[PDB]
């Protein structure tokens, strides 16, 4: 799981999760990762360097393999150039004349047979592409929502945990904007998933604590100075 945890996943939200489904050869499971090189990556399925998600893959020799030869799975072996990340190529052109024999057919078939041991068995791959960002969250975990309180409590807006107060804001958030960010790269305002109101995120009250005390060999009474904080706060 790139960028996410395999167990700490039911407590977060996502914008749009896409499950890429494809079956590759057993020994060919080496390039399913961000920034890999090879024939399969550069010809059939390439992952971007900024991929985020779990590359789920398991053995399926008992399902996608037949002793008589399961030739329903093909793979592109020849191509004019390298394949871009997240690109599909279904063309059956010959990579010359109209037919092959000299240029060859780039669509070869896998020899999926139960006789072949590990390495040549079919493996089903489910690429759960995750995109967690400032986009409005459309899918979340099974966690339930709590009552909304305003004016110093912990908040959880679409997985964004923190601590601060909530106040009625007068901003102009756009319908496609869900999270706000200030100069300090912190979240200053967030849109509630249930109600379309905008609430500012402000940290609770704090301040330096300066202790005014004489020498120990003189007395033990001390004074407290809450610098930067008024007495009414």
């Amino acid at each position, epitope marked *: 799981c790139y960028g996410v945890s395999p167990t700490k996943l039911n407590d977060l939200c996502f914008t749009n999760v896409y*499950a890429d*489904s494809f079956v590759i050869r057993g020994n060919e499971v080496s390039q399913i990762a961000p920034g890999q090189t090879g024939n399969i990556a550069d010809y059939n399925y390439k992952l971007p360097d900024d991929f985020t998600g779990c590359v789920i893959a398991w053995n399926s020799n*008992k*399902l*996608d*393999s*037949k*002793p*008589s030869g399961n030739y329903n799975y093909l793979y592109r072996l020849f191509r004019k150039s390298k394949l871009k990340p997240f690109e599909r190529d279904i063309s059956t052109e010959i990579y010359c004349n109209g037919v092959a024999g000299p240029c060859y057919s780039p669509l070869q078939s896998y020899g999926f047979r*139960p006789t072949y041991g590990v390495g040549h068995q079919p493996y089903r791959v489910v690429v759960l592409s995750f995109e967690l960002l400032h986009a409005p969250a459309t899918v979340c975990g099974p966690k339930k929502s709590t009552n909304l309180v305003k004016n110093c409590v912990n908040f959880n807006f679409n997985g964004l945990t923190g601590t601060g107060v909530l106040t009625e804001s007068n901003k102009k958030f756009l319908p496609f904007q869900q999270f706000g960010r200030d100069i300090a790269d912190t979240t200053d305002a967030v849109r509630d998933p249930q109600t379309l109101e905008i609430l500012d995120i402000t940290p609770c009250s704090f301040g330096g604590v300066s202790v005014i005390t004489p020498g120990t060999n003189t007395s033990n009474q001390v004074a407290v100075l809450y610098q930067g904080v008024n007495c009414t706060e």
Partner: antibody
Amino acid sequence: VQSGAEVKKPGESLKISCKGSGYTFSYYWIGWVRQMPGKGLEWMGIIYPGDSDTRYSPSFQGQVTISADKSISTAYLHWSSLKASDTAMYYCARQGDLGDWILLGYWGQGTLVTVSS
Amino acid sequence: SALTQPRSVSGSLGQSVTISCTGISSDVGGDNYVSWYQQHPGKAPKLMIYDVSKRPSGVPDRFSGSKSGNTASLTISGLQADDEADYYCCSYALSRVVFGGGTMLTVLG
């Protein structure tokens, strides 16, 4: 050729069988499909000749188990605490090289189990 | 979901008949998970039509199928006396085997 269906009472753990031929019982899926009088076919589950990764129907998770014999290539079924509505024509089917793993290429003969008292 | 099939049809010798099949589901990987089975009354069922995009072995060419959305149809031509049998469509897109409500093919003459 299949074994006969003897009249049994609910709770005697009867057994049915079917004999197939024309293939190798090594990597071809095989299962059983019943048919009650007056209704269509009902798929229960299948079994693999190697590791028995049996996948039973949601309506047959705890009602029938597969106990097929591999040494003689003869399928068998085991029951426990049967009911009166268990009377059905059980058909033995295999994967076959015609379709996918779940597709049934060939079928058995079928035996109608009779339950009465 | 449950597959819906006509309980009884009325064909004719030399004519054609189309058996309907609705309620077919689909999963990621394809939508042609449609197969038909031929079961004679009191006899052993035999695989007749599967992967309608192709043609099974041993089955006569007078049997074919089609796909239109979630509704499938079984086109059978050249109805004869021995063609009287039960037919059921199957859907196995979600790795689960389901059958229709039963079809009885009857011919006139």
